[PDB]
Design a binder for this molecule. Structure first.
Ligand SMILES: NC(=O)C[C@H]1CCc2sc3ncnc(O[C@H]4CC[C@H](N5CCOCC5)CC4)c3c21
Length: 272
């Protein structure tokens, strides 16, 4: 169960919700889609307090109650505020872009993160849950750089309101179709970010969308080697080509042609 926390019990921990950076001496880290994530303390135990939508608050708690795994973030409590075990190495997105002078992730580290994330998605799917917002900003990293999937506020059926990040969304997801296959597509984009070290979308880039590179490689214009993150010293053609092959398979426009998360895990496992 999650501890019954009051707004008062969680206002003090955040230093009356101090909206200043930690690098200068504050309590604000950054935003998290539907809120702001603040650094907190519950008896010499660092926590992540997410101040935020009411139904999305309710959905995180329901999914978190049913799903406990090595590769999912941990919900400790709630009050609107949600309390989690603090991920000291922030998001995969921040680490791929070396935000705040953090050193680049090695190829070895990237393979472990890719494997962990897939174990996380597999656990969710095995428990009949579709994430609906798989992206590098939602893949957090612990003290050992373990990938932990987060943001279950949005977790074949059609919907009136299309929700998720467009740069990561599957064609059918953008058309309002909810399927676990959409999560596979979104994971394929994350694998492209791992290989390239590039964000899924950059308005000041040619191509603006990262999944457009899949078509430059497919139509023999370029190769995966021309796009490998130059901030690595340990990558090898074989494992890089193996991870690209998985991403390519994930990024099929036809949902039935994409692999299931179990086949994805297996392929990433074979890779190492
Ligand atoms: N899905 C999420 O929103 C992550 C939340 C929910 C569950 C948890 S557990 C946890 N532990 C640590 N940080 C956390 O989110 C930080 C949010 C700001 C980020 N920023 C981007 C801009 O630049 C600064 C960093 C870095 C990560 C979290 C989170």
């Amino acid at each position: 169960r999650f501890h019954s926390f009051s707004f008062y019990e969680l206002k003090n921990v955040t230093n009356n919700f101090d909206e200043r950076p930690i690098s200068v001496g504050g309590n604000k880290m950054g935003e998290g889609g539907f809120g702001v994530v603040y650094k907190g303390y519950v008896n010499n135990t660092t926590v992540a307090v997410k101040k935020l939508l009411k139904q999305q608050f309710d959905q995180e708690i329901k999914v978190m109650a049913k799903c406990q795994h090595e590769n999912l973030v941990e919900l400790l409590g709630f009050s609107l505020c949600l309390v989690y075990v603090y991920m000291p190495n922030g998001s995969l997105l921040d680490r791929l872009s070396c935000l705040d002078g953090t050193p680049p992730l090695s190829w070895h580290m990237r393979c472990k993160i890719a494997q962990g994330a897939a174990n996380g998605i597999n656990f969710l799917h095995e428990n009949h849950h579709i994430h609906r917002d798989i992206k590098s900003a939602n893949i957090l990293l612990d003290e050992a750089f373990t990938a932990k999937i987060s943001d279950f506020g949005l977790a074949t059926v059609m919907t009136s309101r299309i929700v998720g990040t467009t740069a990561y969304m599957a064609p059918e997801a953008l058309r309002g179709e909810i399927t676990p296959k959409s999560d596979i597509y979104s994971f394929g984009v994350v694998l492209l970010e791992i290989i390239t070290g590039l964000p899924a979308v950059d308005e000041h880039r040619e191509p603006q969308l990262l999944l457009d590179i899949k078509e430059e490689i497919e139509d023999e214009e370029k190769t995966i080697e021309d796009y490998i993150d130059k901030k690595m010293n340990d990558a090898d053609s074989t494992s890089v080509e193996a991870m690209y092959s998985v991403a390519s398979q994930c990024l099929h426009e036809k949902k039935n042609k994409r692999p299931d998360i179990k086949k994805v895990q297996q392929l990433l496992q074979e890779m190492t």
